[PDB]
Write a protein that binds this ligand. Structure first.
Ligand SMILES: Nc1ncnc2c1ncn2[C@@H]1O[C@H](COP(=O)(O)OP(=O)(O)O)[C@@H](O)[C@H]1O
Ligand SMILES: [Zn+2]
Ligand SMILES: [Zn+2]
Ligand SMILES: [Zn+2]
Lengths: 312, 641, 539
């Protein structure tokens, strides 16, 4: 088949509706809960949050089977999770042959492409009243596997698709389906620090920003204006975000350009608006309570992975 | 033209170019890489090795990068290493007997024609862990750096498929064909024709040796949100009993893929291929840190000897640097220059740093005929104000020491310190995991915040501070093991901001005996005054003044390398036996200092004998006792209260 | 190829056996007794001979042995045949065993690779288990599925499944068969689990282990929890545990080439473990009459025996005395009802750290015949006492060799007493109250017996023992466990400069490699035999 002559994957991305409204839609940011069944495989954009994705790993799309005797190749095709190999020689020269010399396979001629899974979880403000939200799975392949990391706003795009499960063989009525979705593109409203590069407009943004002046105290003014005053502490948070400067000893040590801050004080005065604005704006952000699951939930877990036997 | 299918690799041209590079390589990389006497870099290996009868050889990548005619060989051994090496194992015998032509020899030629040869490319182009290996670049020469968790037993594999016919007093034989066996069902038609009558025996057949190793990956860069992975691989025969728990490693190999079964029941398989690595060479040592005790590991040495595998166990030396060492030891500013050189980025902390270095010498490792052992390790404590380089010192030592683990606070337990038992995710069987205590068996065991630790975790170190032996009695496991690691750790004060006028043997939130049995402690009070503060200020600022502190090399500081190698030769070749003069100055020292127990006796001797090891004496002396008791009373600051 | 060779080996070997006879006249020229060996064997019909390697490898320069030791199994059937011939030749319902002892070399388990296959090779290790005698398929009949035609033969080692040939071959399918049980021969079996020894071990290490299997009358010479020196050949067996592992996996398949027109491929997967077998095993790990007759005649030899039992340690005579009577047991029989006693005695000591308590442990575990050092803390009682299997490897369960189950007629030296758990001291109490134990899990019940004599190690609450309070408020361990104790000791220090100086002298002299500072009246050697005399004197 022509699939092993392909030196190119494809990964779509849908429109942003800003252009669909130009000249006049189809796929809005949707829920884990608002599938409505009929949206299997239709074109879609889901938001939410990624809890846990496994590591990228390889998976066949096309076999390379060669003959010992005929010296010719065979192309065994799989799209399932599984297959059964091809051992006896059904070759084309062995067809016109008494003896049927055994064939075997390759480790390089045989096509490959990776396969990685990810779990969305639902956004809070769109859960209806009193309702415990629910989960979902996606499958990805190949190139875009590296554009996903847990803890972020996301707008996955693609298509929601089925697969073979029926429950577990007693609580059944037939035709039942476990399911998944296709990954083709990632946008996220949170731009991590390592995606930065200047251009002919964002440099203009920084320009017109710096042009006004008073830039330092202006920043520490714009930090969470919902709450009153104490510019000295808004400034200290700004500096916590900066972190500092990394320096290396070059003798087997470095030292952090990193900050650590505290705001002791009595109640009544505002305390928490700060932290919530912080984790609102800063990426790679985190809130915790004080007590509850502090035993290990601030710490490293141990878990087996669904899609592959491994101790992650 | 000669060429391989799907390949751009010639046999004989590779042989010729190999040979010409081989006849022509004379420290070229010193010239072309950089600015840095000798001649024919490689050829000496190949001249020397013959009389010693060894079928191995090591090899760089850079020397191909240096020589002219090897730049294309680089990308080809890279892509087709087992193929390029199936070539070179032949090109090597070819070059051998093309070089013997200029020589007349006693008849050693009964062997080399019967011989094989193999290579080991070790120092190669860097690779970024595991994540980089998207499937584009599977099955390629690769390099990595990390440490060990778990070792399996030996996989055998059919290597000669013996076959017993049922009749006609006839055996049969057949070998493996890309990793299978196709039993000949027939019965050797001529003598007897029974088209499926034959049997199989194992005790005849030839077996391979294969082993698998769990490894922890220790990169130099990671992305935003990273965490450890645990990878398996495969080594094969003549490499067995080399790499195990307690070792950091730089390594090489080949990344590959493989599927697995759905069951023990039929041939239905997985769309996704489990990955792995096959092994090409391992690097057990390096430059930026010293090596194992040469006494500890004797049985392993003589085993590798008997096995005729000689991949490294100890770094080797030069005589010109031996002389360099006997020169550098002649001067008398050792006892301070070592100190100034341990930590140029830091202020004085003289006795502190000196004690660090003396533990890095360790001391004495004696045994008795059957009923004694006394080990070179002295358990160390620190205490005093925060806001100093205590933690920095400790990170530094944990780096620079080869065999050691770091612990913090109350997040640790006896279970995760002595043996614990678990299950494999692949085999689903009951396999164990070694403990962080025993992993450092020989070297460093580092802790921080000793005070808040659980009394359950603090209960175990009663015995480790004496015998270097943990014991276990839990599920299916009964064995008292060895944990020769040393202890080196911080304590924090009682309360905060200190209490100058109080018995500091009570001012810690820590009881007496635990503290008294430490061989030595160091104290980090503040004593605020200029002439110690401004100097430190510039001392730490001029670090920041540069992008990295090379102009810290001023004020007489050594490099790490001559230092570490001097240390290693010291650690590995001298044995100071105790002397008579030191008795009368040690005894009175201990007794008069009692005015708090007998362990500081053992501390003084195990540290003064290290003072003797330093200066490269094969004897202790009275004087070592002097600085010993001196610096002890300086440590706890005898004069104040 | 050895169709020619092996019978020549047979001839050469039976020649070796016969040409040697009972010499050693006046303890002179050793000639080899194998003739009278099998004579004295046929006296009892045990059929189970020994061989020495030395007196074999003398003749023919041992080049005989050099290749035999690697290619044993190829010649082994022929080896036994010549014995049968010799027995036929010189002696007048026959199955046999053989063994070769006193090999020169040792290989640890790590010292065994894939070239010693079918090779005799001597290993030593340790035991943690035994298993169930189950008599084994030596010979066994079969019968035709269409007549009473019996076949009294067997495929024996593996391939235990199917003969072919029928006496009256006229059959539609002679390929398969029936069976029978009685026209058969059997022989015993036994399984252990073999284990590393401590004095040979690496770093970052577990005692790597593996299975060994017995045969024949030499069985009953196994034992749990003891070091042993085995000898046999590198038997191996299939496995599938080794699945999920990398790289490629061998697989067997019959040929379909050169013959055609005749899972249909009949494919078997093959992957194995390297177990071991044993031809013979031994328990590793006179003028003595005059020796002990001379020692006993003294009077202060009490004091000698006292002081000689921890020259490694300084003073504290009470420790010495108590430990010297601890091994000595009390007569548990002196009753009439059959309600009985915990005849032995028990110990503990207290003392602040910076003390030499653990020196005594390490001594006695470095001396004791039966003993163990353990945690005191890092242990479940499932480790002390025996947690057992639930019907694994098909066959029935087997009681695990308990750690605290051990110390039969001995000791379980245990340090770190204070940090014991709730349930472990509970179990200990149950162990001490009677001299018996009861166990259960998965419905199974147990009952065991022991007379354990503990010495162990106290650690006070803060370590500091307030001299003006009583024992209980400081000990922190409940009454019954604090009770049953014939003895308690205390070891606490103070300023005495004259004696402290000589103590430091002793300590620092100990950093003189193997000095003569420990010069005792005598050593462990005669002590152990003195104990084995004395344990059974009955006053
Ligand atoms: N200076 C302020 N201006 C406006 N609202 C405030 C101010 N101080 C406190 N509040 C209100 O009172 C609450 C204070 O809660 P906060 O101090 O953030 O958490 P906690 O009291 O638990 O530390 C907030 O909901 C906030 O809206
Ligand atoms: Zn074909
Ligand atoms: Zn035949
Ligand atoms: Zn029949």
């Amino acid at each position: 088949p022509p699939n092993l002559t392909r030196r190119y994957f494809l990964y779509f991305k849908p429109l942003s509706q800003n252009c669909a409204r130009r000249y006049r839609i189809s796929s809005k940011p949707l829920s884990v809960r608002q599938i409505k069944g009929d949206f299997l495989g239709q074109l879609i954009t889901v938001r939410g949050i990624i809890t846990r994705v496994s590591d990228v790993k390889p998976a066949v799309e096309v076999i390379a089977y060669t003959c010992d005797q005929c010296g010719y190749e065979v192309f065994q095709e799989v799209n399932s999770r599984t297959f059964t190999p091809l051992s006896e020689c059904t070759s084309e020269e062995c067809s016109q042959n008494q003896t049927k010399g055994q064939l075997f396979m390759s480790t390089r001629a045989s096509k490959f492409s990776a396969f990685q899974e990810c779990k969305i979880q639902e956004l809070s403000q769109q859960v209806p009243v009193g309702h415990i939200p629910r989960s979902l799975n996606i499958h990805v392949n190949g190139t875009l596997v590296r554009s996903l990391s847990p803890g972020d706003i996301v707008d996955v795009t693609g298509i929601f698709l089925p697969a073979p499960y029926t429950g577990f063989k007693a609580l059944k009525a037939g035709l039942l389906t476990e399911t998944y979705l296709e990954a083709q593109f990632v946008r996220q409203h949170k731009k991590k620090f390592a995606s930065f590069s200047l251009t002919s407009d964002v440099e203009e943004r920084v320009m017109e920003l710096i042009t006004s002046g008073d830039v330092y105290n202006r920043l520490a003014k714009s930090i969470a204006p919902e709450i009153y005053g104490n510019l000295d502490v808004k400034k200290a948070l700004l500096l916590l975000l900066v972190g500092g400067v990394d320096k290396r000893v070059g003798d087997g040590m470095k030292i952090r350009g990193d900050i650590n801050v505290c705001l002791m004080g009595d109640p009544g005065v505002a305390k928490s608006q700060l932290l919530k604005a912080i984790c609102k704006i800063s990426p790679r952000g985190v809130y915790t309570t004080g007590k509850g699951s502090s035993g290990v939930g601030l710490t490293a877990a141990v878990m087996k992975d669904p899609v592959t036997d491994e101790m992650i | 033209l000669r060429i391989i299918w799907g390949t751009n690799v010639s046999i004989q041209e590779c042989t010729t170019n190999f040979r010409n590079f081989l006849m022509s390589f004379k420290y070229k990389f010193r010239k072309i890489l950089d600015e840095r006497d000798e001649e024919l870099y490689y050829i000496k290996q190949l001249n020397e090795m013959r009389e010693l009868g060894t079928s191995n050889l090591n090899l760089d990548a850079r020397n191909l990068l240096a020589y002219k005619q090897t730049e294309d060989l680089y990308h080809q051994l890279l892509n087709y290493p087992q193929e390029v090496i199936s070539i070179m194992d032949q090109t090597i015998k070819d070059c051998m007997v093309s070089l013997i032509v200029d020589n007349n020899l006693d008849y050693d030629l009964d062997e080399i024609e019967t011989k094989f040869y193999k290579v080991r490319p070790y120092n190669v182009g860097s690779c970024k862990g595991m994540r980089e290996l998207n499937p584009n670049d599977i099955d390629k020469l690769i390099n990595l750096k990390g440490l060990v968790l778990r070792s399996t037993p030996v996989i055998p594999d059919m290597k000669v498929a013996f076959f017993k016919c049922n009749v006609c007093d006839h055996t049969m034989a057949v070998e493996i064909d890309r990793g299978v066996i196709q039993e000949p069902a027939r019965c050797e038609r001529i003598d007897c024709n029974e088209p499926n009558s034959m049997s199989l025996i194992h005790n005849r057949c030839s077996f391979a040796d294969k082993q698998v190793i769990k490894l922890q990956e220790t990169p130099d860069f990671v992305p935003d949100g990273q965490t450890p992975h645990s990878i398996s691989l495969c080594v094969y025969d003549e490499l067995v009993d080399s790499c195990r728990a307690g070792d950091r490693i730089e390594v090489t190999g080949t990344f590959r893929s493989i599927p697995i079964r759905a069951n023990s029941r039929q041939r239905v398989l997985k769309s996704l291929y489990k990955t792995y690595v096959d092994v090409v060479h391992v690097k057990k040592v390096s430059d930026k840190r010293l090596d194992v005790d040469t006494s500890t590991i004797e049985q392993e040495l003589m085993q590798n000897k008997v096995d005729h595998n000689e991949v490294e166990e100890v770094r080797q030396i030069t005589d010109q640097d031996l002389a360099k060492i006997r020169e550098v030891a002649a001067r008398e500013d050792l006892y301070s220059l070592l100190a100034r050189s341990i930590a140029p980025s830091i202020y004085e902390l003289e006795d502190v740093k000196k004690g660090i270095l003396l533990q890095l010498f360790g001391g004495t490792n004696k045994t008795f005929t059957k009923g004694g052992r006394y080990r070179g390790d002295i358990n160390i404590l620190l205490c005093g104000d925060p806001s100093t380089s205590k933690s920095q010192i400790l990170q530094y030592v944990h780096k620079i020491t080869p065999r050691g683990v770091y612990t913090s606070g109350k997040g640790s337990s006896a279970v995760g310190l002595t043996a614990y038992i678990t299950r494999d995710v692949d085999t689903k069987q009951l396999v164990l995991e070694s403990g962080a205590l025993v992993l450092s068996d020989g070297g460093v065991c580092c802790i921080d915040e000793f005070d808040k630790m659980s009394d359950s975790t603090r209960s175990v170190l009663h015995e480790v501070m004496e015998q270097q032996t943990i014991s276990i009695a839990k599920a299916g496991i009964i064995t008292t093991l060895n944990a020769r690691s040393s202890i080196l750790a911080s304590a924090n004060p009682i309360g905060s901001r200190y209490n100058p006028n109080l018995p500091v043997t009570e001012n810690i939130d820590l009881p007496p005996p635990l503290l008294s049995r430490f061989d030595l402690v160091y104290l980090v009070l503040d004593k605020v005054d200029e002439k110690n503060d401004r100097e430190l200020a510039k001392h730490l600022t001029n670090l920041y003044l540069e992008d990295k502190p090379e102009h810290i090399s001023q004020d007489d500081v050594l490099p790490v390398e001559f230092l570490t190698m001097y240390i290693s030769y010291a650690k590995e070749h001298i044995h100071p036996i105790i002397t008579e003069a030191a008795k009368t100055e040690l005894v009175r020292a201990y007794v008069g200092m009692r005015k708090a127990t007998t362990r500081q006796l053992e501390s003084m001797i195990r540290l003064a004998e290290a003072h003797a090891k330093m200066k490269l004496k094969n004897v202790v002396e009275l004087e070592d006792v002097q600085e010993a008791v001196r610096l002890i009373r300086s440590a706890i600051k005898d004069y104040a209260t | 190829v050895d169709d020619v060779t092996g019978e020549k080996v047979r001839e050469a070997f039976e020649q070796f056996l016969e040409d040697f006879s009972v010499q050693s006249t006046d303890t002179g020229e050793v000639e080899k007794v194998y003739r009278a060996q099998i004579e004295f064997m046929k006296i009892y019909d045990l059929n189970t001979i020994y061989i020495d390697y030395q007196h074999l490898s003398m003749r023919e320069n041992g080049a005989l042995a050099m290749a035999i030791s690697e290619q044993y199994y190829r010649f082994l059937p022929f080896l036994q045949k010549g014995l049968r011939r010799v027995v036929r030749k010189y002696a007048p319902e026959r199955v046999f065993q053989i063994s070769f002892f006193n090999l020169p070399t040792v290989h640890r388990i790590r010292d065994i690779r894939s070239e010693k296959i079918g090779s005799l090779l001597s290993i030593s290790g340790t035991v943690t288990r035994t298993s169930e005698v189950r008599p084994e398929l030596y010979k066994a009949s079969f019968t035709c599925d269409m007549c009473r035609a019996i076949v009294d033969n067997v495929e024996q080692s593996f391939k235990y499944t199917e003969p072919t040939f029928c006496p009256n071959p006229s059959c539609e399918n002679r390929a398969f068969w029936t069976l029978n049980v009685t026209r058969s021969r059997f022989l015993d079996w036994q399984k252990v689990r073999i284990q590393e020894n401590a004095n040979e071990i690496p770093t970052g290490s577990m005692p790597r282990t593996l299975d060994v299997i017995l045969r024949g009358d030499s069985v009953e010479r196994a034992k749990p929890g003891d070091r042993c020196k085995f000898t046999g050949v590198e038997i191996v067996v299939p496995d599938v545990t080794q699945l999920g592992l990398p790289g490629v996996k061998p697989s067997s398949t019959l040929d379909t080439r050169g013959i055609s027109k005749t899972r249909s491929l009949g494919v078997r997967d093959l992957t194995y473990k390297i177990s071991f077998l044993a031809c013979h095993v031994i328990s590793i790990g006179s003028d003595e009459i005059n020796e002990l007759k001379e020692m006993v005649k003294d009077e202060h030899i009490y004091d000698k025996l006292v002081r000689s039992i921890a020259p490694a340690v300084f003073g504290h005579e009470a420790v010495k005395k108590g430990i010297l009577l601890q091994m000595l047991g009390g007569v548990h029989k002196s009753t009439v009802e059959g309600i009985k006693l915990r005849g032995d005695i028990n110990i503990c000591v207290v003392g602040d750290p910076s003390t030499s308590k653990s020196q005594f442990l390490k001594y006695v575990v470095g001396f004791a015949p039966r003993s163990v050092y353990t945690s005191g803390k890092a242990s479940s009682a499932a480790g002390l006492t025996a947690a057992v299997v639930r019907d694994e490897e098909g066959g029935d369960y087997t009681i695990e060799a308990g750690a605290l189950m051990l110390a039969d007629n001995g000791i379980c030296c245990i340090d770190e007493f204070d940090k014991m758990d709730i349930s472990d001291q509970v179990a200990i109490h149950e162990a001490m109250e009677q001299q018996t134990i009861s166990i259960a899990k998965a419905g199974i019940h147990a009952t065991l017996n022991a007379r354990t004599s503990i010495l162990a190690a106290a650690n006070p609450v803060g370590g500091r023992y307030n001299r003006k309070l009583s024992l209980r408020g400081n000990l922190n361990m409940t009454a019954p466990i604090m009770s049953r104790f014939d003895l308690f000791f205390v070891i606490l220090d103070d300023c005495n400069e004259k004696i402290d100086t000589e103590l430091a002298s002793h300590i620092v002299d100990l950093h003189m490699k193997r000095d003569e500072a420990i010069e005792p009246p005598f050593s462990a050697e005669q002590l152990r035999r003195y104990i084995k005399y004395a344990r059974t004197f009955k006053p």
